[PDB]
C-alpha cells in the first residue's frame, strides 16, 4: 500500500492505493434495496394527496390526464358555443 516514489523535479510521493470494490453481492443488495424503496414510494406517494390532479383546475375544465385534452377542449368549446348560438338563432336570437 505505502510506496515512496522518487521524482527529479518536485518532491517524493507516499502513495497508498487502497484498491477496493463494493463487491458482487453488495451491488446486488443495493439494487435490491433501491427497488424496494421504489416499491415503497410507488405505493405510498401514489397514495398521497396529489394536489394538482385533484382540483377543479385540472379535473374541472377537462382533466382526463392526456396532453390533447387542452387542444380538443379549446377546439370543442368553440363548437359548443357555435351550437348554442345556432340553438339561440333557432328561437329568434
Amino acid at each position: 500500500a505505502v510506496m515512496v516514489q522518487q521524482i527529479e523535479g518536485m518532491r517524493d510521493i507516499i502513495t497508498e492505493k487502497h484498491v477496493w470494490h463494493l463487491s458482487d453481492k453488495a451491488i446486488k443488495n443495493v439494487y435490491m434495496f433501491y427497488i424496494m424503496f421504489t416499491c415503497w414510494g410507488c405505493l405510498y406517494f401514489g397514495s398521497a394527496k396529489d394536489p394538482f390532479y385533484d382540483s377543479e383546475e385540472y379535473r374541472g375544465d377537462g382533466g382526463d390526464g392526456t396532453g390533447y385534452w387542452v387542444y380538443e377542449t379549446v377546439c370543442i368549446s368553440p363548437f359548443l358555443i357555435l351550437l348554442g348560438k345556432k340553438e339561440k338563432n333557432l328561437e329568434m336570437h
Binding site: 446486488k28 439494487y31 427497488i35 421504489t38 406517494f45 390526464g65 392526456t66 396532453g67
Partner: protein, 497 residues
C-alpha cells in the same frame, strides 16, 4: 430448473388480461391493480437478478427453451447476458415509474394500463430472448400497444405522430425480418434461430455485410441514426409523459442494445467494416441533434432531439471496438434511460401545469413551480454529462474508449474527439436555453392570480427516484459497469482475432 424469464415476460399481459371487463368504472381500481402488478413484476425481476444471476459468468443465465413452431425452428429461447440484464432492470424500473406517473389518467384508464403492461411484457421479451425470430416477435409486440397509448393519449397531432411512428418502425422491422430470414436460412447447414448456437458461425463478408445492412436499417430507427431519425421528434414530442418516459427510457435502447447483440457479436467481421462509418455518423449525430434542439421552439421536441444526440455516444461506443467503448454504450443506455425518462416526465408535468408548449412563450415559471424547476435543473445537469451524474462517466468512458482504440489511428481520433466534444459545448447551449426560457424570468401578468400547484409528492417521488440512480452511478459507476464488463470481453474476444 424454473421458468424464470417466462414468468417475467408473460406476467404483465397475463395479469392485465384479468381486466376483461372488471366492472369498476373509476380509474382507482385498475390504476392500483396495475401498479401492484408492475411492482410484483419488478420484484420478480430483482429476485431473478439478485439471488439467481451470477454477475461474473459472461454467458446465458436463466436459460429456457421450448418448441413453438418446428418449421422455422422457432423456440421460446430466453436468456440473460451481462449487456441485457441492465436493460431488463431498466425496463422494470422505468415502466413501473411510467405507470406510476400515469396515475392521474382517467380517460380509458383500463385500456391505458393494460397497454402499459403489454409494453412492459414486450420490452422485457425483446431484451430477454435469445431467439432471432422471437426477438422479432417482441420487437413488433411493442408496436401496436405503444401506438394505442400514443394516439389516444397525449399530444396535439398525436395521430400523425402515431401513424408516422408505427409505419416507420414497421418499415424497419421488415428489414429486421429480412435480416433474421437471411441469417436463419442462408446462415449455415442445419438452419437455426438460437443466438447461443449462432454467435460462432462463418458468415462470409459478402453475405455478412448484407445481413449487417439488413439489421442496421432496422436498428438505425430505434436507436435513431440521423438519416433515419425523423419519427422521434414527432413521436416523443407529441406523446403523454408516462408513455414518453419509456419511449425514450427503454424503447430507444433496443436498437442500441440490438447493435450489440445481432450486429456486434453475431456479425463481427462486418461490424469491423461498418463501425468506421457508424463512428462518423454518431459524431455528426451528436452535433446535428444538439444543433437542431435550439432550433425547436417546443419543449418536448427539444428533449426528443436531446435523445437523438445522446444516442450518438452509444453509436460511438458500439462502433468503438473496445471494452471501454461498449461499456460506455451500455452505461449510456441506462443513464440516458433514467435521464430522458425523468426529463420527459418533468416536461409533461410542466405542460400540464402551465399549458404552454413553446419556449418563446412560457417565460419565468420558477417561482410558480420551484420543485419542478429544481428537478428539471438537476436532470438537465445529468443530461449535460455533469460529474456526480451517470451522464458524465458515460460520455467520458466513451471518449476513453475512442482514445484507447486499436481500430482507429490518431489522425482520425483527433477529429472524432473534437467533433464529439463540441457536443458538450452545444449541449449546455440548448439545455440551459431551455432552462432560462422556461424558468428564469418574471412575467408581470403572472403575479398571484394564477398560483399554480407545485410538484405533488407523487411527481416529486418520480423525479427523485429516477435521480438517485443517476447520482449513485455518477459517484460509483460500477453499479452498471460491473454487470456488463465481463460480457463485453466475450464480445471483444470475437474482434481481436
Amino acid at each position: 430448473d424454473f421458468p424464470w424469464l417466462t414468468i417475467i415476460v408473460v406476467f404483465p399481459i397475463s395479469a392485465g388480461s384479468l381486466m376483461l371487463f372488471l366492472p369498476h368504472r373509476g380509474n382507482k381500481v385498475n390504476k392500483w391493480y396495475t401498479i401492484c402488478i408492475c411492482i410484483l413484476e419488478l420484484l420478480l425481476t430483482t429476485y431473478a437478478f439478485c439471488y439467481n444471476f451470477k454477475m461474473d459468468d459472461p454467458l446465458i443465465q436463466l436459460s429456457e427453451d421450448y418448441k413453438w413452431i418446428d418449421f422455422f425452428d422457432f423456440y421460446w429461447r430466453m436468456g440473460i447476458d451481462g449487456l441485457s440484464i441492465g436493460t431488463i432492470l431498466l425496463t422494470g424500473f422505468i415502466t413501473t415509474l411510467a405507470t406510476l406517473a400515469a396515475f392521474p389518467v382517467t380517460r380509458d384508464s383500463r385500456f391505458f394500463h393494460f397497454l402499459m403492461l403489454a409494453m412492459y411484457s414486450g420490452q422485457i421479451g425483446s431484451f430477454s430472448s435469445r431467439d432471432l425470430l422471437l426477438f422479432f416477435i417482441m420487437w413488433e409486440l411493442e408496436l401496436i400497444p405503444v401506438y394505442l397509448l400514443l394516439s389516444m393519449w397525449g399530444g396535439k397531432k398525436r395521430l400523425y405522430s402515431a401513424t408516422k411512428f408505427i409505419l416507420y418502425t414497421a418499415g424497419s422491422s421488415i428489414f429486421l425480418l429480412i435480416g433474421v430470414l437471411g441469417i436463419s436460412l442462408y446462415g449455415s447447414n442445419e438452419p437455426t434461430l438460437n443466438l447461443e448456437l449462432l454467435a460462432n458461425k462463418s458468415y462470409p463478408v459478402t453475405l455478412e455485410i448484407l445481413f449487417y445492412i439488413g439489421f442496421l436499417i432496422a436498428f438505425a430507427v430505434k436507436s435513431p441514426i440521423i438519416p433515419l431519425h425523423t419519427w422521434l421528434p414527432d413521436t416523443h414530442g407529441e406523446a403523454h409523459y408516462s408513455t414518453c418516459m419509456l419511449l425514450a427510457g427503454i424503447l430507444l435502447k433496443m436498437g442500441a442494445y440490438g447493435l450489440v447483440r445481432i450486429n456486434m457479436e453475431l456479425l463481427p467481421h462486418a461490424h469491423s467494416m461498418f463501425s468506421p462509418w457508424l463512428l462518423v455518423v454518431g459524431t455528426i449525430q451528436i452535433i446535428y441533434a444538439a444543433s437542431t434542439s435550439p432550433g425547436q421552439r417546443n419543449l418536448k421536441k427539444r428533449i426528443a432531439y436531446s435523445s437523438v444526440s445522446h444516442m450518438g455516444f452509444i453509436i460511438i461506443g458500439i462502433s468503438s471496438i473496445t471494452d471501454p467503448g461498449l461499456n460506455g454504450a451500455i452505461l449510456q443506455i441506462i443513464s440516458h434511460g433514467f435521464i430522458g425518462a425523468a426529463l420527459f416526465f418533468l416536461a409533461g408535468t410542466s405542460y400540464d401545469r402551465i399549458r404552454l408548449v413553446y419556449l418563446d412563450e412560457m417565460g419565468g415559471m420558477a417561482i410558480s413551480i420551484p420543485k419542478i424547476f429544481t428537478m428539471f435543473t438537476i436532470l438537465s445537469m445529468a443530461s449535460l454529462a455533469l460529474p456526480g451524474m451517470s451522464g458524465f462517466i458515460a460520455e467520458f468512458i466513451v471518449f476513453f474508449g475512442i482514445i484507447t482504440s486499436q481500430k482507429y489511428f490518431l489522425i482520425s481520433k483527433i477529429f472524432i474527439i473534437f467533433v464529439m466534444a463540441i457536443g458538450m459545448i452545444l449541449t449546455p447551449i440548448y439545455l440551459l436555453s431551455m432552462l432560462r426560457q422556461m424558468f428564469y424570468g418574471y412575467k408581470l401578468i403572472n403575479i398571484k392570480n394564477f398560483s399554480f400547484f407545485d410538484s405533488g409528492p407523487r411527481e416529486l417521488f418520480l423525479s427523485i427516484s429516477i435521480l438517485l440512480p443517476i447520482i449513485g452511478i455518477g459517484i460509483y459507476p460500477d453499479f452498471v459497469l460491473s454487470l456488463a464488463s465481463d460480457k463485453v470481453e466475450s464480445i471483444l474476444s470475437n474482434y481481436f482475432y
